[PDB]
């Protein structure tokens, strides 16, 4: 819902913020502290949340643009170089009541929360790895609150958090089919 005096862009995606740093990101706490510490280095619309893979540091050169791919055209600016960096995504996802689980491929770590509760967590650095996470329930059909953080401490980078509604038999990428920046229905 609206919570201030600023109209918010309605689009079929999550609100994305990118933050870079020249300090080391070791874990979720480090990245959240970076987000806390300053304004985003860039904003974007996260409409197709399947990013990377690439090499030679996400925070260098045009690597962020390459990583974000189809979403990069919504960047507010081209950040300068940093050694480390990551993204913070927030908004809504349409889910019917039922049981779900994430399966996430990433380098480095990440955390996804739904309706305030963590549902997929890797609290450390790692080369590319895919985790099938534990199932969670959605009690009421509709737009659920969702946020994500992901970061790269350096080197390679990838982030693809897929979701299953059928007990792990099939998984889908979160994209414009079901994402909403504000919780209103997007017609874009």
**In the set 29, 37, 99, 126, which binds ligand GLC (CB under 6 A)?**
126
The verdict on whether residue 4 carries a ligand-binding annotation is yes
Query: Which one of 2-10, 71-79, 113-121, 154-162 is the stretch in contact with ligand GLC (CB under 6 A)?
Result: 154-162
**Contact partner at residue 76 from ligand GLC, Ca ion, none, CB < 5 to 8 Å by partner kind:** none
Site for Ca ion in 95-154 (CB under 5 A): 107-108, 152-154
- Report the SS3 class of residue 88: strand
Which residues does residue 157 pair with via DSSP β-bridges, in sequence order? 54
Q: Could you tell me if 60 and 183 are in contact, meaning their C-beta atoms sit under 8 angstroms apart?
A: no
Peptide bond into 53 cis (omega under 30): yes
CA 30 to CA 9: how far, in whole Å?
29
**Contact partner at residue 126 from Ca ion, ligand GLC, none, CB < 5 to 8 Å by partner kind:** ligand GLC
Q: How many Cβ atoms from other residues are within 10 Å of residue 22's Cβ?
A: 10
Q: Could you tell me if 169 and 99 are in contact, meaning their C-beta atoms sit under 8 angstroms apart?
A: no
Query: Per CB under 6 A, does 108 bind ligand GLC?
Result: yes
As a whole number of Å, the end-to-end CA separation of the chain is 19
- Report the SS3 class of residue 68: helix
Query: Which one of 2-10, 15-23, 74-82, 124-132 is the stretch in contact with ligand GLC (CB under 6 A)?
Result: 124-132
Residue nearer to ligand GLC on the CB measure, 147 or 156? 156
Residue nearer to Ca ion on the CB measure, 41 or 119? 41
CA 16 to CA 142: how far, in whole Å?
21
In the shown chain, the binding pattern of residues 15 to 54 toward Ca ion, with x for contact by CB under 5 A and - for none, equals ---------x----------x-------------------
Query: Per CB under 6 A, does 57 bind ligand GLC?
Result: no
- Residues belonging to the binding site for alpha-L-arabinopyanose are 107-108, 153, 156
């Amino acid at each position: 819902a609206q919570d201030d005096s600023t109209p918010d862009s309605l689009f079929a995606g999550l609100v994305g913020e990118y933050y870079g740093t020249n300090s080391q990101l070791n874990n979720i706490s480090d990245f959240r502290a970076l987000v806390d510490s300053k304004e985003a280095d860039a904003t974007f619309e996260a409409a197709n949340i399947s990013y990377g893979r690439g090499s030679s540091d996400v925070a260098k050169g045009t690597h962020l643009q390459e990583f974000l791919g189809s979403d990069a055209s919504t960047l507010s600016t081209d950040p300068g170089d940093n050694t480390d960096g990551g993204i913070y995504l927030q908004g809504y996802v349409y889910l019917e009541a039922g049981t779900y689980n994430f399966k996430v491929t990433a380098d480095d770590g990440y955390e996804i929360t739904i309706n305030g509760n963590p549902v997929a967590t890797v609290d450390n650095n790692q080369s590319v790895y895919t985790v099938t996470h534990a199932s969670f329930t959605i009690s009421e059909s509709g737009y659920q609150a969702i946020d994500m953080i992901w970061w790269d401490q350096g080197g390679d980078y990838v982030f693809q958090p897929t979701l299953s509604a059928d007990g792990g038999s099939t998984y889908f990428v979160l994209d414009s089919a079901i994402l909403s920046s504000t919780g209103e229905t997007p017609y874009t």
